[PDB]
Write a protein that binds this ligand. Sequence first.
Ligand code: MYC
Ligand code: ZN
Length: 228
Amino acid sequence: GDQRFGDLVFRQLAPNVWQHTSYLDMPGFGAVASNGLIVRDGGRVLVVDTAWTDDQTAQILNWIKQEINLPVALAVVTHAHQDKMGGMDALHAAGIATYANALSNQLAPQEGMVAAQHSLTFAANGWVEPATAPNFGPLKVFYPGPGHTSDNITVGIDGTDIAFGGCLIKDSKAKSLGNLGDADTEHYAASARAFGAAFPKASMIVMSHSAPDSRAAITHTARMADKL
Ligand SMILES: O=c1c(O)c(-c2cc(O)c(O)c(O)c2)oc2cc(O)cc(O)c12
Ligand SMILES: [Zn+2]
């Protein structure tokens, strides 16, 4: 299941869906694990989120060119943070089209992260406009609302029952909601539940700080956010 490649770990979730794990060394804390997704669409590769650093992000591309040997069409990130947008330069240097939430690109310079080349707009229902998200294929982007951040988005993999909750949704064994610094203590539960309503056929909920859990993770996250 878990393959150690360089300094990252890769785990196959589905025939064309792989999960990558980035690690950050924090002096006095340890190694922070951040999960991501790699989806193969026929002859092209699609990546969700980057690593903690451009270096680690490039290592992912090396793995892609090794096991998949296919070119990456575009990359979509969840929110403007170093835990997901730490390798934006690597994507640009490789000539990969970066797509992110319109707000994420605005918060990027503030947080000190490189803004994406394209911006995604979302309707009142939370669904991304097809115009801003062209040739995405199975990458279905949905914006639940203010949760971990005000720009956090979720990505579902069409054709499968796999949904990426980013750093918003936590596992059913989580004790905390993770980072509550830039988080919202009012719409957190609503946003978490919105994700479950958006992708009801998704049985595999992949997060960025834990392994892919069942739909129980969504309910657990919602229950934890209900106490805010
Ligand atoms: O996603 C993040 C995250 O999980 C943590 C984190 C740090 C800890 O020390 C923990 O104990 C923990 O559970 C999470 O760092 C972060 C710091 C940021 O500036 C932004 C983030 O998005 C994260
Ligand atoms: Zn973040």
